[PDB]
Enzyme design. Structure first.
Site, PDB file in Angstrom:
ATOM      1  NE  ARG A  13      -3.560  -0.255   2.761  1.00  0.00           N
ATOM      2  CZ  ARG A  13      -4.817  -0.019   2.481  1.00  0.00           C
ATOM      3  NH1 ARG A  13      -5.376  -0.509   1.317  1.00  0.00           N
ATOM      4  NH2 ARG A  13      -5.255   1.150   3.282  1.00  0.00           N
ATOM      5  CG  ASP A 144      -6.021  10.959   9.788  1.00  0.00           C
ATOM      6  OD1 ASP A 144      -6.588  11.765   9.041  1.00  0.00           O
ATOM      7  OD2 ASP A 144      -6.249   9.547  10.006  1.00  0.00           O
ATOM      8  CE1 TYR A 157      -4.895   5.872  12.290  1.00  0.00           C
ATOM      9  CE2 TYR A 157      -6.474   7.622  12.635  1.00  0.00           C
ATOM     10  CZ  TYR A 157      -5.286   6.762  11.864  1.00  0.00           C
ATOM     11  OH  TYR A 157      -4.960   7.406  10.571  1.00  0.00           O
TER      12      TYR A 157
HETATM   13  N1  LIG Z   1      -4.905   4.753   3.831  1.00  0.00           N
HETATM   14  C1  LIG Z   1      -5.303   6.062   3.993  1.00  0.00           C
HETATM   15  O1  LIG Z   1      -6.578   6.729   3.415  1.00  0.00           O
HETATM   16  C2  LIG Z   1      -4.915   6.977   5.310  1.00  0.00           C
HETATM   17  C3  LIG Z   1      -5.325   7.957   5.580  1.00  0.00           C
HETATM   18  C4  LIG Z   1      -5.063   8.778   6.695  1.00  0.00           C
HETATM   19  C5  LIG Z   1      -3.655   8.551   7.202  1.00  0.00           C
HETATM   20  N2  LIG Z   1      -3.148   7.410   6.631  1.00  0.00           N
HETATM   21  C6  LIG Z   1      -1.803   7.046   7.294  1.00  0.00           C
HETATM   22  O2  LIG Z   1      -0.713   6.637   6.113  1.00  0.00           O
HETATM   23  C7  LIG Z   1       0.228   5.380   6.542  1.00  0.00           C
HETATM   24  C8  LIG Z   1      -0.114   4.530   5.592  1.00  0.00           C
HETATM   25  O3  LIG Z   1      -1.448   4.158   5.299  1.00  0.00           O
HETATM   26  P1  LIG Z   1      -1.660   2.635   4.854  1.00  0.00           P
HETATM   27  O4  LIG Z   1      -3.231   2.495   4.596  1.00  0.00           O
HETATM   28  O5  LIG Z   1      -1.040   2.291   3.737  1.00  0.00           O
HETATM   29  O6  LIG Z   1      -1.462   1.972   6.157  1.00  0.00           O
HETATM   30  P2  LIG Z   1      -2.000   0.393   6.561  1.00  0.00           P
HETATM   31  O7  LIG Z   1      -1.860  -0.426   5.313  1.00  0.00           O
HETATM   32  O8  LIG Z   1      -3.120   0.371   7.319  1.00  0.00           O
HETATM   33  O9  LIG Z   1      -0.765  -0.333   7.123  1.00  0.00           O
HETATM   34  C9  LIG Z   1       0.441  -0.122   6.851  1.00  0.00           C
HETATM   35  C10 LIG Z   1       1.493  -1.285   7.472  1.00  0.00           C
HETATM   36  O10 LIG Z   1       1.420  -1.121   9.092  1.00  0.00           O
HETATM   37  C11 LIG Z   1       2.167  -2.021   9.472  1.00  0.00           C
HETATM   38  N3  LIG Z   1       1.448  -2.519  10.806  1.00  0.00           N
HETATM   39  C12 LIG Z   1       0.416  -2.595  11.211  1.00  0.00           C
HETATM   40  N4  LIG Z   1       0.329  -2.994  12.689  1.00  0.00           N
HETATM   41  C13 LIG Z   1       1.701  -2.972  12.982  1.00  0.00           C
HETATM   42  C14 LIG Z   1       2.542  -3.537  14.053  1.00  0.00           C
HETATM   43  N5  LIG Z   1       2.087  -4.027  15.194  1.00  0.00           N
HETATM   44  N6  LIG Z   1       3.858  -3.627  13.858  1.00  0.00           N
HETATM   45  C15 LIG Z   1       4.596  -3.396  12.892  1.00  0.00           C
HETATM   46  N7  LIG Z   1       3.770  -2.827  11.870  1.00  0.00           N
HETATM   47  C16 LIG Z   1       2.364  -2.701  11.762  1.00  0.00           C
HETATM   48  C17 LIG Z   1       1.174  -3.244   8.754  1.00  0.00           C
HETATM   49  O11 LIG Z   1       2.528  -4.145   8.287  1.00  0.00           O
HETATM   50  P3  LIG Z   1       2.496  -5.603   7.696  1.00  0.00           P
HETATM   51  O12 LIG Z   1       1.297  -5.730   6.462  1.00  0.00           O
HETATM   52  O13 LIG Z   1       3.889  -6.069   7.390  1.00  0.00           O
HETATM   53  O14 LIG Z   1       1.731  -6.536   8.731  1.00  0.00           O
HETATM   54  C18 LIG Z   1       0.846  -2.621   7.441  1.00  0.00           C
HETATM   55  O15 LIG Z   1       1.137  -3.352   6.190  1.00  0.00           O
HETATM   56  C19 LIG Z   1      -0.431   5.234   7.944  1.00  0.00           C
HETATM   57  O16 LIG Z   1       0.396   5.883   8.947  1.00  0.00           O
HETATM   58  C20 LIG Z   1      -1.841   5.774   8.069  1.00  0.00           C
HETATM   59  O17 LIG Z   1      -2.275   5.798   9.591  1.00  0.00           O
HETATM   60  C21 LIG Z   1      -3.391   6.427   5.693  1.00  0.00           C
HETATM   61  N1  LIG Z   2      -9.047   4.649   5.008  1.00  0.00           N
HETATM   62  C1  LIG Z   2      -8.259   4.809   5.899  1.00  0.00           C
HETATM   63  C2  LIG Z   2      -7.296   4.921   6.912  1.00  0.00           C
HETATM   64  C3  LIG Z   2      -7.218   6.346   7.739  1.00  0.00           C
HETATM   65  C4  LIG Z   2      -8.302   7.351   7.304  1.00  0.00           C
HETATM   66  C5  LIG Z   2      -8.552   8.247   8.540  1.00  0.00           C
HETATM   67  C6  LIG Z   2      -9.531   9.088   8.439  1.00  0.00           C
HETATM   68  C7  LIG Z   2     -10.011   9.765   9.839  1.00  0.00           C
HETATM   69  C8  LIG Z   2     -11.107  10.561   9.936  1.00  0.00           C
HETATM   70  C9  LIG Z   2     -12.009  10.637   8.899  1.00  0.00           C
HETATM   71  C10 LIG Z   2     -11.688  10.130   7.584  1.00  0.00           C
HETATM   72  C11 LIG Z   2     -10.498   9.432   7.545  1.00  0.00           C
HETATM   73  N2  LIG Z   2      -6.150   6.233   8.488  1.00  0.00           N
HETATM   74  C12 LIG Z   2      -5.497   5.084   8.426  1.00  0.00           C
HETATM   75  N3  LIG Z   2      -4.678   4.635   8.873  1.00  0.00           N
HETATM   76  C13 LIG Z   2      -4.104   3.137   8.578  1.00  0.00           C
HETATM   77  N4  LIG Z   2      -2.916   2.656   9.202  1.00  0.00           N
HETATM   78  N5  LIG Z   2      -4.736   2.509   7.497  1.00  0.00           N
HETATM   79  C14 LIG Z   2      -5.795   2.952   6.789  1.00  0.00           C
HETATM   80  O1  LIG Z   2      -6.286   2.383   6.089  1.00  0.00           O
HETATM   81  C15 LIG Z   2      -6.309   4.380   7.468  1.00  0.00           C
END
Ligand SMILES: NC(=O)c1ccc[n+]([C@@H]2O[C@H](COP(=O)([O-])OP(=O)(O)OC[C@H]3O[C@@H](n4cnc5c(N)ncnc54)[C@H](OP(=O)(O)O)[C@@H]3O)[C@@H](O)[C@H]2O)c1
Ligand SMILES: N#Cc1c(/C=C/c2ccccc2)[nH]c2nc(N)[nH]c(=O)c12
Ligand SMILES: NC(=O)c1ccc[n+]([C@@H]2O[C@H](COP(=O)([O-])OP(=O)(O)OC[C@H]3O[C@@H](n4cnc5c(N)ncnc54)[C@H](OP(=O)(O)O)[C@@H]3O)[C@@H](O)[C@H]2O)c1
Ligand SMILES: NC(=O)c1ccc[n+]([C@@H]2O[C@H](COP(=O)([O-])OP(=O)(O)OC[C@H]3O[C@@H](n4cnc5c(N)ncnc54)[C@H](OP(=O)(O)O)[C@@H]3O)[C@@H](O)[C@H]2O)c1
Ligand SMILES: NC(=O)c1ccc[n+]([C@@H]2O[C@H](COP(=O)([O-])OP(=O)(O)OC[C@H]3O[C@@H](n4cnc5c(N)ncnc54)[C@H](OP(=O)(O)O)[C@@H]3O)[C@@H](O)[C@H]2O)c1
Ligand SMILES: N#Cc1c(/C=C/c2ccccc2)[nH]c2nc(N)[nH]c(=O)c12
Ligand SMILES: N#Cc1c(/C=C/c2ccccc2)[nH]c2nc(N)[nH]c(=O)c12
Ligand SMILES: N#Cc1c(/C=C/c2ccccc2)[nH]c2nc(N)[nH]c(=O)c12
Lengths: 251, 250, 249, 251
Positions: A13, A144, A157
């Site tokens: 991702r 975030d 979170y």
């Molecule tokens: N996706 C969104 O829309 C979004 C929105 C707001 C903020 N963010 C932020 O952007 C970043 C990337 O988001 P994402 O959706 O790609 O993240 P994600 O896929 O939810 O998680 C990324 C990785 O975190 C690792 N992880 C989870 N629990 C863990 C633990 N206990 N120890 C070590 N590693 C751990 C996992 O590794 P493994 O798969 O190897 O287990 C997972 O692949 C995050 O910090 C997230 O909070 C994302």
């Molecule tokens: N979708 C989403 C995620 C979000 C989205 C956060 C959000 C919070 C308030 C309102 C809308 C999105 N944060 C995540 N963090 C991790 N590690 N993985 C995720 O998939 C997301």
């Protein structure tokens, strides 16, 4: 010599997209992962096939515990063992699930959510800083954009993400005299959670002013690349929202 | 029947001032403390002398650990045991010391600074909500300077930032239960006992409004407001009580 | 076809560095100026020497008045007149001076400080959108608006208003594919009038290098935001302040 | 001797409730108004019936113009004429309507929206400070809890409210040495526009976490009363949201 970056949770991702872009830019990379061993190894294979000796893996659980400081030290160590330097740290790994105020024990929920999103970032930052011209050293924390308008029932979170803003600022201030910049990138909605049905995903996409779609992982990675680059040399303590306007939309 | 409040870290300083003001307003109070047993009991005695059976003490370490959820549940339980209800929670207890990035193991530093400032407030909020014209609210003691933090105070500032997120997330989530969640954010109020008068004066001279620190009473005054019926539509707000300190650039 | 940008207050200092980088990047540029006519022409001459017919100057007072909307319309019109298109707007022009609460009439101070820093950006934004690729606007904000300089209330009011405009316009123009973002210096090029001891006092306060940002470092952030590497970014303000805003009193 | 307050836009709705509460707390009040002369005169009559010569009216357009400074100075003068002192200024008067980016002329919309919400507060603040341990002097600005999540097409209004935050902070810093505190109160949704159908009111009501209802004017006034009180004497540069949690609610 090519600089080296550590990316936590880089197997899939957004973290995967970050590792790939840094590698394309010329970095050697440590691919940290927790459970996604196959994806991590496959990514290291792909990157090394592009340029030999430019990618390794490092497994660690980043849950809060008595042994987390050691694990964080070993992650930074893996970059020095492989590449002889560590120029960039990207704190991307993150637990994300609901923790209603009214499955795992609450103490486990605390450990996982606060560990991955905040304590591990702090310990990794300590180890990075301790381990350190034309250097361009920096840290990028994945924050975030919606921390002030949080998802219902995600208090742990949101606490972790808020603490990570605090670390970004605190570490920017403290590390500035060593020339280490500390910044953030704040997605809104990017890759939606795999568990999510395309209908529920569509409810989120329709709320985004810019294009009514989520950010690609690559669009997130673009902001990380900017922050680590020479074009951001005076930037520290800044968090760049990459949210297509989502955080501006009232209820 | 008088309502009841739990104030954490209430034996001395700002927490005592809060407990006292709430008691003066008509509240029965749980005076939680960790190490300051003599001061806690002494305050409880003063308050019961004013109004019999209106104050109890409750000892707990709020350092993070696997039993912290139990300790927090017990603090709330103690209010119900003494008073049969729990209207107000004030999250005041806080560890505060530097943790340089470059005595205590870092594990301990994390547990104390993040436990007291964030995780205990979260667990106490859970227990408070679970046990419930009422006027139920929670007030979290925040920090006006979180975006302009003291050098080498990473973990403390992380904990205070987490506390802002709890304030917001809990205000959102508990609103349907009539539970308001707000904060009060001192800038400089009572300076640390270990601080020398010269260094105290250096901080004082930075404050635009009066060149002095807030009294504990001034901090308590903002708590009293937020718990009152004058704040019935206020939730998720953090009121700075900082004499303009946070507005002053480097 | 090369895209075209309007940079307000582009004759000198930060706006010049922005015009220069945009031009280096491939843009044709409208160098807006108010009083610095020779500097504006000299910069146009330099850029046209590099690539013919790629820079024009455009004169306008951006003080608030009943004719300000017409002047802002004319600036955007001048970009279409020269280049047939207008892809980027950079709201950089700014009055900056103290207006204590306790030479110029207060009416004039309000018109200048609020006109240049907020109302002109609003009207330029309106005209930009009405006249419509990778379209975007960048507003030069201020990293210190929550810790303002003493006695600078109208300047700070204007810079706060400009954050509001950045947000409101990002929301409203997103359906047209126009992104609206900000760049917020802390201390960059210090004022010409400022004495060197006062400059050094400010330099010493910056955690990252104890120096002010170059105008080029500010321009780097502007270039990022208008680029294809910022295509999902709107309503964001990037501080470029070396940590200055994190430093308590 | 009793203290005195100026409240702008005090003839109706929130300004009225603020004037009434201040008067109830013991203040003499200047009821400023623009068009609502019947309402303003009736209010002063009701208050004067309660305590003799404790209320006066003062009409002024607070649209930005060349004469706005004199007008604002005369509002402050009216409080000294009536009551010999001016302890509290409440900047409440406000124009509020859409100004889409893509029939009043736009220069008139600027003058009204920026004049009422920001420029007039600034000029009143100048006049109030210029005219100045037992004393408790303060200003309260009526802000908007939603300024970072603004209504679509309300850019000039939103700009005016953001400038008012700036004023609040700047004036707090600068007037602190005179003992004048400057704070704000930020409603989310309170008294909804009077024409608005209940079914549209309900769309906003259902979004408010705390009780699914708008704030009463009195609930807003309660926060103003706190801020001008002796219980807020260390509070300056603070903006108190009075929004039932609305601003915490994501799209
Ligand atoms: N996706 C969104 O829309 C979004 C929105 C707001 C903020 N963010 C932020 O952007 C970043 C990337 O988001 P994402 O959706 O790609 O993240 P994600 O896929 O939810 O998680 C990324 C990785 O975190 C690792 N992880 C989870 N629990 C863990 C633990 N206990 N120890 C070590 N590693 C751990 C996992 O590794 P493994 O798969 O190897 O287990 C997972 O692949 C995050 O910090 C997230 O909070 C994302
Ligand atoms: N979708 C989403 C995620 C979000 C989205 C956060 C959000 C919070 C308030 C309102 C809308 C999105 N944060 C995540 N963090 C991790 N590690 N993985 C995720 O998939 C997301
Ligand atoms: N003073 C200031 O200027 C200032 C500035 C900004 C924010 N604040 C905030 O306002 C609040 C009150 O400030 P303060 O200066 O009065 O606080 P303090 O005296 O530093 O701390 C209050 C109490 O916290 C309790 N505590 C510390 N570690 C604990 C642990 N592991 N478990 C349980 N309780 C523990 C202690 O109880 P025992 O004594 O019983 O051990 C202590 O008396 C705090 O949240 C603080 O962060 C204060
Ligand atoms: N420099 C810093 O440290 C710093 C810090 C924070 C924010 N910023 C922001 O960054 C931007 C650029 O800063 P800067 O120091 O380069 O700016 P500046 O030199 O103070 O002003 C830039 C230009 O603004 C134009 N201008 C001033 N009043 C005008 C009016 N009434 N109508 C039209 N144009 C007018 C002037 O054009 P002419 O010379 O042609 O008359 C001037 O060259 C500004 O928005 C500023 O607020 C700068
Ligand atoms: N209602 C809400 O939910 C809400 C939400 C966020 C913020 N607020 C803020 O809270 C305050 C009170 O809100 P409200 O709904 O009670 O306001 P309002 O009724 O919309 O307006 C208050 C008064 O402003 C005066 N006013 C309007 N244009 C003027 C001009 N050109 N010159 C002088 N006075 C003028 C009017 O006086 P006349 O009637 O005498 O002409 C009007 O009665 C405002 O600052 C508003 O922005 C309210
Ligand atoms: N002084 C002080 C304190 C502060 C001050 C915070 C601050 C941060 C940045 C700049 C100025 C003050 N926080 C405290 N927390 C606890 N538990 N106890 C304290 O004594 C303080
Ligand atoms: N230095 C500086 C400037 C600043 C700096 C603002 C500031 C505010 C608070 C604390 C520190 C710097 N803003 C400017 N705007 C314009 N148009 N021109 C300038 O020279 C500056
Ligand atoms: N409703 C409402 C108002 C609002 C609400 C602003 C808002 C902005 C974003 C999201 C929700 C509400 N502001 C007002 N100002 C004045 N002068 N009069 C009003 O009636 C309102």
């Amino acid at each position: 010599e090519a600089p080296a970056a550590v990316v936590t949770g880089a197997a899939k991702r957004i973290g995967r997209a970050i590792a790939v872009k840094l590698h394309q830019t010329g970095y050697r990379v440590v691919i940290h992962y927790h459970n996604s061993a196959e994806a991590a190894v496959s990514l290291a294979d792909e990157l090394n096939k592009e340029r030999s000796n430019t990618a390794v893996v490092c497994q660690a659980d980043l849950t809060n515990s008595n042994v987390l400081p050691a694990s964080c030290e070993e992650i930074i160590n893996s970059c020095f063992r492989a590449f002889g330097r560590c120029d960039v740290l990207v704190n991307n790994a993150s637990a994300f699930y609901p923790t209603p105020l009214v499955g795992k024990t609450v103490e486990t929920q605390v450990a996982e959510l606060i560990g991955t999103n905040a304590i591990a970032p702090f310990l990794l930052t300590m180890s990075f800083a301790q381990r350190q011209t034309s250097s361009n050293l920096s840290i990028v924390n994945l924050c975030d954009a919606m921390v002030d308008q949080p998802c219902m029932a995600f208090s742990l979170y949101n606490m972790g993400k808020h603490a990570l803003v605090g670390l970004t600022q605190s570490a920017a201030l403290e590390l500035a005299p060593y020339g280490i910049r500390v910044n953030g990138v704040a997605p809104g909605v990017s890759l939606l959670p795999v568990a999510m049905g395309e209908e529920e995903k569509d409810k989120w996409r329709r709320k985004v002013p810019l294009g009514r779609r989520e950010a690609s992982a690559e669009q997130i990675a673009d902001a990380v690349i900017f922050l680590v680059s020479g074009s951001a040399q005076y930037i520290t303590g800044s968090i760049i929202k990459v949210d297509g306007g989502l955080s501006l939309v009232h209820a």
